[PDB]
């Protein structure tokens, strides 16, 4: 099997497979072959998960996710009934990076931190499937869970340049991620104080990253779902003015550092979304205030040029939903976005809030009433059994039963 | 300072200090010095934490803790009012070891895992303290939180022989642990089957580990709180017969693997309690079935031979508390154990149940009712604000405001 | 594919494939399937490398390796024309474990350490291949190097029980190891003083680890080459007397610890070799003194019972070869052992001695004659270019050209 | 001690101590205290190492170091008589990063990789001092080695913006680094093609990083030696024209990326050297061609405005020293440079060349002569025993002696 033969084979697949419908690549298949090496190592979960995610995203009304920061959190989301897992960069920074430090969301943690948390979840999901399968329960049977839910992972802005982006994608696929998202800001050069806020890079550079992320997915031989995030809705600063796509938004003012001020909002958002559309699989306008009217406008704006383009949407945990929206709007919210084209929706900091509220809640009681506090939680756990909560049986949950099986198999 | 002069001053320490009242070392100060190396690196956190944990242990009616598996979990425990943090090896095995796999409690994960998580908690707590200080709150002010609560870490049975034990203790101290506990089983050779279970090591070997654990502490130069765990209440197997301390409890029988069956119960527990009492600072009989009668008997038995000697108790999270107790005994459970001398008490798997319930409860709602399940959580958070819950202000919690102060100091 | 069908294909394979000729599994194909899980994840390197390693040790006169502790060491070994890579646990303990400590050889480092290094080597070997390929060179072309040389890994005594070994084997395979060895001592309890040395475990427990290793290899779905090591030649202690295979060698004495003293040498080693042979692909009797006489007796001892059994041999880096053997004996030593059936041979600590001598030497002259000492080293490197040494082009070697390719493919 | 008193004591230290003569701090003692937290944690090794390095640098004719990528290498460097250790980022990228990947030099590895290696080297040295001390040797015996040589570590360009540099400097300090350098390029955005090369950042930004670095040293409470590197001799691109200091060098041309082409050489190097001098302890103009002539002009240009400013020089390992310089020039090179003010000098990739050549040379021979090749190395190792090479007694070298002493201390 020659280089030429591998390239034609690859090229036909981009042309034929409807997975790649309307997806531009600023590189040839001959390029992908040159950068493969001679042998291709298989990445099962990255491949199966990406295909599963693609299917779910295209057939289902929508898919909703919560941010997970541990394997257990992700597991309980699959057991609760969810179909995909979201890995927040913010959560990892905050409470689960390889540096073991607590950080804000400014790309401070080491570049391998999220891929290691992707592997954590997949290793936990792999264990649960093993526990299930070890107890005789086959696919088809009543109660059977597919524990290999697709993971979608935060890749920040690549942790530097195109090569960092390229390597970050690879780390993700190796760790078993089904989807990855690259944003178009520099959170490492955020201007502080009044007149500050987020800082964007040129469309030129955001595109070069996505090109890098797709090159990396191809070289790895996985059809990973690529998500393009834009921060243009609120980002009113840009590092440079060279890209003609961005000049229309310049207010003409500069800052001490040399950034150009820009006019934020929907129009800036749209020009990014449109520029990223040919290269990404989903587009995502990062929002702080959840608003269906805004969402409809953005959706329509993108759909004018790319009809039926899959979108994604993050529901802010910071926003006060009861104060600003009535129960009917809150209750219908995700369904309405689903109609619009927002096929992937998620709460980024779900796990943070859950973890942090649970423990504070228990502890405050514990400090006051001691063991009675714990029983409140325990009874709550028993009440949850009905709905599918097996973790009360703590030993079986971590895989005690499975490893006994292993020891019994060897000692016999 | 010469080796003689350093050895004198260390012995003088062991004879002088009331911290070392009642405690036996099977080695000389000359030995500690011969193994220190020429210079003694300082471990701020380990030292101050042991000292704070000691005073607490000896003055408060008692000290109660809950298992934490992330910095966030610990951090809330301090904000909740708790004065100490417990670090389960079960929970790390289950969801926070550096291998990133889900294991059962059998020392399967890599030996540096718990110390890694000790270091996390202390990194987070250090960040909690920096935020508070950078906001201009001084100690003595209202609402000021001492974030540096001492950590009591689980060292299993040292992960091998005496050297593994020795090296693990150094890892714990370097991370900044304030207490470490060692147990007298081999979970690595737990027997499966009807005639199986936990398996003890000779008193001789358990004491061997305790010596190594304390020698570790002295070489690091920290008065670390050492805790000895016997599993001799339920464990009915032992690997060997050599120790005369253990022969009285044998039943003459031998298993296939060459272990010796023993008669489990309070008396076996007791002999191990008495054996370890000269070497460890607190003695802990691990129990599966919480019982005030049992507790009081084991309290009186040890106190007859070592009066005043501190103790600790694990309040099993798997046991059905209401099923087997009335609210009044439950509500006065820890209270009572204090009086008996159980100055350190904890729920090993508190963090597991806290983490795993919340995410499930949330996801199950989120699955069926989307955003309104998150709203239910968000409203609970707002209620907890009065009681000290600051996590709602998520940006400030993770250090955003602290790191903004770092950026403003540089760029001005 | 149903469970019974899967077990059918697997069982038949063990009977049909000459790879498994002479090999006994103390467990069924149904057990393997039961413990796999629902999906099998692929491990390309582990598989291809295990298939390649097997081909070499059966078809070549003998395969020889040197111990490597970084990826560069390994990368060079392959460019020098060696066909296999050895990964010492001693070298890892000493200079390349994840604890970052300098340690002696008593299984003191974290259990995940050697896999981390096996993975590092493969990452490097993957990069040498990507470079070669990216430059246009194809297989068959003059000069083309096969950079995927298989790695045989030190798993010590498995760091505990059968689960610990199971898991380490899985880490070895996941990291891309092609061979793994397990020794029958318990280094963790090495007796000190005159009346001491290595302690053996019962033949029963050794075989239990070997079966554990095989089970894992089957559960991962890789035909990994399993090497059983005996320390019975020197070891004159044993932990327990239950196994009838060991009783013939007991003296009847017992140490303070409870160990039983035994009669070391060729007879004890053979009883172990013979006991392990059914379970392992290679048998290894560890020696301190190299001796062709001893080798032949052991080879013939094994071969009477197991004709043509593949054996492996360690050539001590500490033995004074020139003082005790003449040059012609030294020159033929590995060829001679090959004909006896030692098909895999290595020098455990070749990298330790390479690395430490080369730096000391450089540093010693540099401290006295500064840049003149480095020019000596640089001039040696120039002479090596004739012989295949490419690392003078230091940029290309680490992949500067490859990543400039990736930069160029994304940009323009 | 109130905040006011702390600030005053710290301010007095800056105005009083000669260590800080001619060092500008773009911030106040009040600021350092605000960001300290409520309790400073001690970092013995970083503090003592910094002070030691400061004395050596101000008193020796010069100090010279080689690049070390393992603890063993630094250990041999100290045994051979070198007075400090250098830690190359290039080397860590290529063979020692925590990602486990072979990388070129463009800040691809995870940001914590170099601190981890600084921590490894310190652990090895710490162990060496333990072995020595446990053998009875005291300071001021004939041959007593001070194994705690200072480490000067590569921080590249801080892996992002001011806060990334801040955090990296803190990681260095915690690992026990004595010196740290930061360069003024964005390696992560290297221009490819014939019209490309390295890319400088604005003077203004390089100083912000240096300011950040110093703020970190002060917050950590150690007098860490801060080196400022400039790539302005060969770099002919810059990200922006915002800085008046840089404008003079612009050729008015621009690239597709929107970078500004500059005029490289001594003049642009001087403007950076002068710009950084007030914030750095040493100044380093990185050069590709070792030229004494150049080194002189540069030294003079700097000392014109900052008399007696300590400089540092990297001695290129790629340069063909013999083809270009006669042996007497090669011999006088580090002495001559020292006489100009270059008080820290180092060969960056010494470790890479020593490790790769040695293993290639051993392995090439081993492929063709087997053991006779290893015996050449072993004989070579015996000859260096005269000179201080202790590694042939290999069990002692890695601490078998020390840990035996510990086991015997425990078992007695």
* CA pair distance D57, A380, nearest whole angstrom: 66
Q: Which residue is closest to B137 within chain D, CA to CA?
A: D38
Among C208, B90, B200, C220, CA closest to A407: C208
Question: Which of C363, C371, C408 lies nearest to residue D334, judging by beta carbons?
Answer: C371
**Residue A290: both structure tokens together:** 């959840």
A201 in Cβ contact with A184 (< 8 Å): yes
Residue A210, CB half-sphere, CA atoms under 13 Å: how many?
31
Question: Which of B27, B208, B403 lies nearest to residue D163, judging by beta carbons?
Answer: B403
Q: What is the DSSP letter of D260?
A: E
Question: Which of D112, D188, D257 lies nearest to residue A110, judging by beta carbons?
Answer: D112
**Shortest Cα–Cα distance, A235 to chain B (Å):** 18
**Residue A269: both structure tokens together:** 């958002």
Question: Which of C148, C163, C405 lies nearest to residue A406, judging by beta carbons?
Answer: C163
**Residue B72: both structure tokens together:** 């966030």
SS3 of C64, please? strand
A98 in Cβ contact with A113 (< 8 Å): yes
Domains of chain A (ranges, CATH numbers)? 1-412 (3.20.20.60)
Q: Is B232 exposed, middle or buried (0-12, 13-18, 19+ CB in 10 A)?
A: buried
Supply the residues of D annotated as catalytic.
Answer: 192
* CA pair distance A231, A198, nearest whole angstrom: 8
**Residue C328: both structure tokens together:** 């012609």
Question: Which of C38, C138, C208 lies nearest to residue A411, judging by beta carbons?
Answer: C208
**Shortest Cα–Cα distance, B17 to chain C (Å):** 33
Supply the residues of C annotated as catalytic.
Answer: 192
What are the C-alpha distances in Å from D185 to residues A49, D202, D238? 39, 9, 8
Per DSSP, the residues of B209-221 read HHHHHHHHHHHHT
**Shortest Cα–Cα distance, B242 to chain C (Å):** 6
D271 annotated among ligand-binding-site residues: no
Chains touching chain D, criterion 3+ CB pairs below 8 Å: A, B, C
The resolution in angstroms reads 2.7
Pick among B64, B65, B77, B80 to test the A interface (most A CBs inside 10 A): B80
Query: Which technique was used to obtain these atomic coordinates?
Result: X-ray
CA atoms A315, A319, A325, A331: torsion sign: positive
Q: How many CB pairs under 8 A join A and B?
A: 306
Q: Which residue is closest to B98 within chain C, CA to CA?
A: C112
How far does CA B66 lie from the centroid of its chain? 10
* CA pair distance C363, C411, nearest whole angstrom: 43
Q: Residue C21: which residues within 8 A CB-CB, separation 6 or more?
A: none
Among D94, D262, D283, D87, CA closest to D168: D87
**Residue A68: both structure tokens together:** 């997970």
Contact call for B3 and D39, based on CB within 8 A: no
D229 annotated among ligand-binding-site residues: yes
Strand B250-254, strand B260-262: pairing: antiparallel
B192 is catalytic: yes
CA angle A165, C396, C346 (to 5 degrees): 105
Catalytic residue among B192, B256, B383, B410: B192
* CA pair distance A404, A401, nearest whole angstrom: 5
* CA pair distance D178, D84, nearest whole angstrom: 9
SS3 of C67, please? strand
Residue with tokens 């070499």: C56
What are the C-alpha distances in Å from D260 to residues A208, A280, C179, D233, D252? 20, 31, 54, 16, 7
**Shortest Cα–Cα distance, B132 to chain D (Å):** 8
SS3 of A170, please? helix
Tallying the residues shown for chain B, one arrives at: 412
Q: Is C386 exposed, middle or buried (0-12, 13-18, 19+ CB in 10 A)?
A: exposed
Among C172, C89, C78, CA closest to C128: C78
Q: Which residue is closest to D166 within chain B, CA to CA?
A: B406
Chain C hits for B247, Cβ within 8 Å: none
D329 annotated among ligand-binding-site residues: no
Among B42, C405, D343, CA closest to A36: C405
The contact set of A with C (CB < 8 A) is 2-3, 26-27, 31, 34-45, 48, 126, 129-130, 132-134, 138-139, 148, 162-163, 166, 208, 211-212, 215, 402-403, 405-407, 409-412
Categorise residue D308: left if φ over 0, alpha if ψ from -120 to 50, beta otherwise: left
D202 annotated among ligand-binding-site residues: no
Residue with tokens 């070697």: C397
Contact call for D163 and A241, based on CB within 8 A: no
Strand D151-154, strand D179-182: pairing: parallel
SS3 of C269, please? helix
**Shortest Cα–Cα distance, A242 to chain D (Å):** 6
What are the C-alpha distances in Å from A13 to residues A10, A37, B154, B162, D113? 5, 20, 54, 60, 39
């Amino acid at each position: 099997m020659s280089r030429q033969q591998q390239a034609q084979e690859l090229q036909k697949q981009w042309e034929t497979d409807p997975r790649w419908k309307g997806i531009k690549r600023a590189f040839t298949a001959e390029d992908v072959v040159r950068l493969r090496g001679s042998i291709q190592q298989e990445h099962t979960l990255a491949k199966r998960g990406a295909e599963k995610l693609w299917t779910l995203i295209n057939n289902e009304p929508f898919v909703n996710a919560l941010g997970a920061l541990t394997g257990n959190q992700a597991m309980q989301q699959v057991k609760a009934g969810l179909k995909a897992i979201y890995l927040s960069g913010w959560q990892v920074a905050g409470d689960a990076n390889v540096a073991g430090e607590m950080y804000p969301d400014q790309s401070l943690y080491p570049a391998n931190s999220v891929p290691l948390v992707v592997k954590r979840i997949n290793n936990t999901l792999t264990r649960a499937d093993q526990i299930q399968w070890s107890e005789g329960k086959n696919p088809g049977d009543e109660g059977y869970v597919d524990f290999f839910a697709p993971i979608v992972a935060d890749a920040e802005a690549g942790f530097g340049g195109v090569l960092n982006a390229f390597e970050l994608m690879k780390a993700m696929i190796e760790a078993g991620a089904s989807g990855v998202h690259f944003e178009d800001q520099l959170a490492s050069v955020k201007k502080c104080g009044h007149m500050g806020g987020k800082v964007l890079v040129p469309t030129r550079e955001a595109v070069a990253k996505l090109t890098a992320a797709r090159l990396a997915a191809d070289v790895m031989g996985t059809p990973t779902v690529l998500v393009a995030r834009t921060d243009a809705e609120a980002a009113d600063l840009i590092t440079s003015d060279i890209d003609d796509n961005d000049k229309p938004y310049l207010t003409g003012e500069r800052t001490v550092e040399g950034f150009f001020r820009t006019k934020p909002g929907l129009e800036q958002a749209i020009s990014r979304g449109l520029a990223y559309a040919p290269y990404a699989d989903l587009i995502w306008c990062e929002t702080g205030k959840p608003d269906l009217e805004y969402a409809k406008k953005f959706a329509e704006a993108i759909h004018k040029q790319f009809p039926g383009k899959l979108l994604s949407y993050n529901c802010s945990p910071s926003f006060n939903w009861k104060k600003n929206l009535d129960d009917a709007t809150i209750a219908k919210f995700q369904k309405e976005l689903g109609a619009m084209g927002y096929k992937f929706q998620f709460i980024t900091l779900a796990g943070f809030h859950a973890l942090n509220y649970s423990m504070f809640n228990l502890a405050h009681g514990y400090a006051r009433t001691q063991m009675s506090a714990f029983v409140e939680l325990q009874q709550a756990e028993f009440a949850a059994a009905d709905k599918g909560f097996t973790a009360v049986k703590h030993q079986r949950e971590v895989g005690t039963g499975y490893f006994d099986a292993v020891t019994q198999t060897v000692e016999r």
